[PDB]
Amino acid sequence: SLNPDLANEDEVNSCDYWRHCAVDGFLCSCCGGTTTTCPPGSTPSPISWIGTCHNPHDGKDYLISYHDCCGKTACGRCQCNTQTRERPGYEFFLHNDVNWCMANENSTFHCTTSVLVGL
Amino acid sequence: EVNSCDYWRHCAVDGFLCSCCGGTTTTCPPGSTPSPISWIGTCHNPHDGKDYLISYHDCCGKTACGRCQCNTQTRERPGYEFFLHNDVNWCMANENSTFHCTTSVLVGLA
Amino acid sequence: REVLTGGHSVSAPQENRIYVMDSVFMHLTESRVHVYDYTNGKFLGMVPTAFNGHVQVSNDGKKIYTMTTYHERITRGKRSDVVEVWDADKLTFEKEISLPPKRVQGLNYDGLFRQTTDGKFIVLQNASPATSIGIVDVAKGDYVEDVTAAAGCWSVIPQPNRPRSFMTICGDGGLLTINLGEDGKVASQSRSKQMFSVKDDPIFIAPALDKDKAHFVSYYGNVYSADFSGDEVKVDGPWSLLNDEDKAKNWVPGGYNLVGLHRASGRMYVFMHPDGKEGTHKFPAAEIWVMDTKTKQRVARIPGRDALSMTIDQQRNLMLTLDGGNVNVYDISQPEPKLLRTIEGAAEASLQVQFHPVGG
Amino acid sequence: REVLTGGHSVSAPQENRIYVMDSVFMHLTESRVHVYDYTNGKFLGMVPTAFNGHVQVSNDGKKIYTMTTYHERITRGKRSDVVEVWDADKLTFEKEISLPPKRVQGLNYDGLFRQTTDGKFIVLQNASPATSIGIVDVAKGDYVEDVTAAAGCWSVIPQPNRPRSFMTICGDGGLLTINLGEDGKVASQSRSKQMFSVKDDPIFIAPALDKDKAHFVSYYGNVYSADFSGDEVKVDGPWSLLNDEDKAKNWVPGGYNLVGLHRASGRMYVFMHPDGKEGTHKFPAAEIWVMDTKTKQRVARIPGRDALSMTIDQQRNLMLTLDGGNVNVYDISQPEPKLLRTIEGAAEASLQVQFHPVGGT
Ligand SMILES: *NC(=O)Cc1c[nH]c2ccccc12
Numbered sequence: 001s002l003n004p005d006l007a008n009e010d011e012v013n014s015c016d017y018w019r020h021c022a023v024d025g026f027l028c029s030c031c032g033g034t035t036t037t038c039p040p041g042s043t044p045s046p047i048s049w050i051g052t053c054h055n056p057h058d059g060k061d062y063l064i065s066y067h068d069c070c071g072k073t074a075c076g077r078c079q080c081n082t083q084t085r086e087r088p089g090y091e092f093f094l095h096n097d098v099n100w101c102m103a104n105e106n107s108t109f110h111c112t113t114s115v116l117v118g119l
Numbered sequence: 120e121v122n123s124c125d126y127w128r129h130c131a132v133d134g135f136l137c138s139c140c141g142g143t144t145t146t147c148p149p150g151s152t153p154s155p156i157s158w159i160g161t162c163h164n165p166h167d168g169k170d171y172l173i174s175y176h177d178c179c180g181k182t183a184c185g186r187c188q189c190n191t192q193t194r195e196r197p198g199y200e201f202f203l204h205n206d207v208n209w210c211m212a213n214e215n216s217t218f219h220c221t222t223s224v225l226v227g228l229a
Numbered sequence: 230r231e232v233l234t235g236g237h238s239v240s241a242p243q244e245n246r247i248y249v250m251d252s253v254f255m256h257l258t259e260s261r262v263h264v265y266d267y268t269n270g271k272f273l274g275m276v277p278t279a280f281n282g283h284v285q286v287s288n289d290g291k292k293i294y295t296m297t298t299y300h301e302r303i304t305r306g307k308r309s310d311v312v313e314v315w316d317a318d319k320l321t322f323e324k325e326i327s328l329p330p331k332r333v334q335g336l337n338y339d340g341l342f343r344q345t346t347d348g349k350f351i352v353l354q355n356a357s358p359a360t361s362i363g364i365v366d367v368a369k370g371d372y373v374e375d376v377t378a379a380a381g382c383w384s385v386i387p388q389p390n391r392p393r394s395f396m397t398i399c400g401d402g403g404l405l406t407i408n409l410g411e412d413g414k415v416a417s418q419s420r421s422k423q424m425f426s427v428k429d430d431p432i433f434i435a436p437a438l439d440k441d442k443a444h445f446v447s448y449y450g451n452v453y454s455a456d457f458s459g460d461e462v463k464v465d466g467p468w469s470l471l472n473d474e475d476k477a478k479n480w481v482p483g484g485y486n487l488v489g490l491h492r493a494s495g496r497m498y499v500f501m502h503p504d505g506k507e508g509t510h511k512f513p514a515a516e517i518w519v520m521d522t523k524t525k526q527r528v529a530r531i532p533g534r535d536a537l538s539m540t541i542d543q544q545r546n547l548m549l550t551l552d553g554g555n556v557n558v559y560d561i562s563q564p565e566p567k568l569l570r571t572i573e574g575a576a577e578a579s580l581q582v583q584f585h586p587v588g589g
Numbered sequence: 590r591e592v593l594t595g596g597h598s599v600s601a602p603q604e605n606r607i608y609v610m611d612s613v614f615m616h617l618t619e620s621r622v623h624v625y626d627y628t629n630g631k632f633l634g635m636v637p638t639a640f641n642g643h644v645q646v647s648n649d650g651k652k653i654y655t656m657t658t659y660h661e662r663i664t665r666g667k668r669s670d671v672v673e674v675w676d677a678d679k680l681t682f683e684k685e686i687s688l689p690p691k692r693v694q695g696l697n698y699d700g701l702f703r704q705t706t707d708g709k710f711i712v713l714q715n716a717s718p719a720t721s722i723g724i725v726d727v728a729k730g731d732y733v734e735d736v737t738a739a740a741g742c743w744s745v746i747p748q749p750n751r752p753r754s755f756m757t758i759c760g761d762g763g764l765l766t767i768n769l770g771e772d773g774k775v776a777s778q779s780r781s782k783q784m785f786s787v788k789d790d791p792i793f794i795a796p797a798l799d800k801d802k803a804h805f806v807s808y809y810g811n812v813y814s815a816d817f818s819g820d821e822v823k824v825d826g827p828w829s830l831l832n833d834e835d836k837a838k839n840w841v842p843g844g845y846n847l848v849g850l851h852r853a854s855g856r857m858y859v860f861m862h863p864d865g866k867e868g869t870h871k872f873p874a875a876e877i878w879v880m881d882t883k884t885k886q887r888v889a890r891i892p893g894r895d896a897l898s899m900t901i902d903q904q905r906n907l908m909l910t911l912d913g914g915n916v917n918v919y920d921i922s923q924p925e926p927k928l929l930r931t932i933e934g935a936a937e938a939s940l941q942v943q944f945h946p947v948g949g950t
């Protein structure tokens with residue numbers, strides 16, 4: 001449940017995959033990267049929106065950091081717009097209608113993912 | 120009729136018709152700049168049955184209009200007969216070469 | 230014989246024009262504003278806005294303002310955040326105004342790029358990710374103030390009853406009010422009491438804006454208000470958009486620019502859908518509800534056409550709705566909106582449409 | 590538990606890779622190269638190429654070269670035409686080479702952006718609209734100078750039997766051959782006799798390219814040849830692609846990068862359609878025809894899948910075809926091509942696909 005690299009790609013590349021519960025953007029795993037690796041030539045964001053998602057496979061709740069990969073034009077693949085627990089900009093780090101590449105050397109948005117922090 | 124790719128004057132348009140972009144067959148949409156150069160076509164007029172020279176000037180310096188895309192090729196030829204050729208950007212010599220839309224300017228009888 | 234000419238003005242009167250901000254998210258570096266005639270659906274022109282542009286029209290109707298980000302080589306090189314002033318009739322670039330490299334990059338809510346009622350100052354949201362509000366003096370073509378008082382707040386709600394005042398929603402669930410002097414620097418400010426519970430009943434940022442107050446709807450279908458008829462904002466709420474039957478099918482609001490106020494009647498327009506639950510706050514409208522804000526009761530409901538964003542024209546009694554690609558034009562002169570037309574393919578990915586100002 | 594990292598190389602080995610040049614004509618300022626694995630249709634990465642990018646892979650397979658146009662403010666400000674060198678494995682930018690502000694802006698025919706056989710020089714089409722050929726010295730990262738001798742000609746056909754020679758097709762219906770010195774300047778040139786009638790039998794610019802000769806098809810379904818095995822080019826043609834039945838149904842070629850040659854067998858591949866007439870030269874393929882260039886006979890015909898452009902890989906005996914959005918992969922090791930798979934949604938608006946080079950010395 002916790003190791004997308006061992007899962008069927010069709011499963012991880014779906015907006016319904018449990019950890020993608022507050023993703024607004026193109027899944028990096030569909031863009032030549034993996035859940036935890038930027039596509040070649042795109043740069044991880046040092047900041048992100050965050051939140052928790054429920055894992056119905058093990059029945060536990062996990063903290064997720066929705067980092068972007070940046071400095072390449074829009075990947076265009078696997079667009080998701082899921083919004084579990086997402087809140088407006090007055091709770092800024094829970095908000096996904098802003099470009100989390102915004103403080104990168106080049107802020108062009110390429111793709112987004114869901115990085116597993118912990119329980 | 121004039122916004123249709125089958126309109127007789129549009130016989131060598133490869134681009135977006137300016138008349139669908141806030142312009143007309145012979146005026147650029149606001150804020151886009153005519154190209155001083157163009158490809159030319161000879162198109163047949165189905166009304167009077169005469170053939171007319173058309174000058175396919177582009178309007179330039181704004182991003183793609185995206186409406187009324189045509190790709191008609193009557194009498195069009197490759198780049199070795201360059202002024203009959205329509206797979207190049209006729210905005211290429213403008214101050215800003217970004218391609219916005221294509222016009223169909225009637226010059227006169229062939 | 231014919232000659233191709235440029236230098237032409239938009240072919241329809243200002244009063245017919247609407248502005249569809251197309252993010253073109255699939256190719257977000259070529260975002261643009263599409264200009265349409267709402268009376269007949271005719272495409273009138275466009276303004277290019279590079280990466281994730283934002284747009285507004287000057288209150289006096291003369292100019293279009295854009296906010297965007299450039300880089301020397303797009304995906305590399307030095308960043309330039311700017312405001313651009315464009316002529317509203319020629320759709321031509323006039324002036325670039327340099328901003329610090331922190332202008333908000335995000336979806337096109339109205340409140341991220343606004344202006345004072347008097348039109349002399351542009352007021353915009355920054356995120357570095359630390360938030361502040363930037364003030365641009367239009368006449369001087371300069372960035373003249375940076376409102377760090379607004380740290381931890383978000384979005385700009387102008388006060389239509391004052392020349393250079395606006396509010397913002399803060400992390401305490403209250404409003405910060407900023408009154409700018411005639412130089413664009415903060416002249417005074419005030420903080421309201423808490424209006425809503427950030428944790429328990431979050432509001433959508435989009436105001437239903439009257440001349441002297443603003444209403445806000447919440448994720449759970451309540452309504453809050455901020456009355457600025459005086460120097461200090463008075464806050465209240467909640468009242469509920471929902472009756473018992475409504476609650477039975479879990480109706481809640483959803484969308485982006487999701488509400489509107491018809492000032493003459495006090496009718497508030499809100500996009501709603503059934504089967505609400507955590508995660509549905511941006512779902513397309515199943516219905517539009519028409520609420521009487523005086524009686525705090527619904528008066529009508531109509532099909533939502535999957536709409537996500539709207540805007541209101543007060544003087545012609547019009548509501549536009551937008552589903553991402555298509556714009557619906559409604560007559561709202563009477564309590565039940567009447568659908569007049571749909572403009573299909575007005576955008577590829579737009580969450581914001583706005584009317585040309587006519588009110589001076 | 591996890592950390593997002595960058596600096597990673599393309600996941601599939603070079604020999605699996607193809608490059609689909611997406612013009613994104615609807616948003617032509619955000620054109621890009623999409624890198625795919627042709628063996629399984631997997632999307633591997635991409636290279637951004639601004640306004641109407643062009644692309645090729647270095648002959649040695651190490652770098653991707655792009656050519657594009659920037660402006661300081663995109664739709665206003667100073668113009669910069671460039672070639673960029675990108676690392677093939679990391680898909681990262683390495684070097685910009687400044688060009689004069691006249692690089693060809695147009696659809697992605699192969700011949701507009703090429704390189705010498707030895708890989709030392711990039712050879713590109715300029716149009717101001719006056720035409721000339723540009724020479725870029727890759728090692729030095731410099732533009733050498735305009736090949737003015739090429740005025741009134743169009744496109745670049747490298748000679749694979751010489752290290753720094755190429756040809757161009759001229760308005761007189763002949764070919765101009767340019768031989769570069771080690772410094773990338775013109776060392777000598779020659780002009781062929783007239784190959785084709787520009788007025789009566791215009792040819793498509795896309796060559797079916799062998800090591801020492803190139804074949805060209807015409808709007809009317811004739812074939813012309815330029816043989817450069819000897820010191821000067823020998824031209825010939827026409828011969829007809831068409832038998833009597835074919836002629837009766839008005840079959841003619843149509844497409845963009847519409848031909849290919851499998852060098853070891855001499856088979857030429859051509860996109861064809863029926864009901865040909867003035868204006869049909871860019872119509873999608875009703876069929877792909879496979880011709881034996883030695884016997885001048887057709888040896889196969891297969892459904893065209895509305896293809897517009899193709900490319901051939903000599904080292905793996907493959908043909909790729911492309912309809913604007915989808916890429917079809919064919920085994921061409923026998924006269925009848927065999928369709929292996931289709932990669933759907935490789936591009937929004939591409940008229941050019943190319944293999945990552947393997948071998949080829
Ligand atoms: N999660 C992201 O960073 C993707 C994203 C979502 N909305 C926007 C708006 C502008 C740029 C990037 C965006």
Ligand SMILES: *NC(=O)Cc1c[nH]c2ccccc12
Pocket residue numbers: 133134135177205206207208209218220221641694695696
């Ligand atoms: N010629 C035109 O008006 C439009 C057009 C068609 N193909 C291209 C390619 C690049 C730029 C403009 C183009």
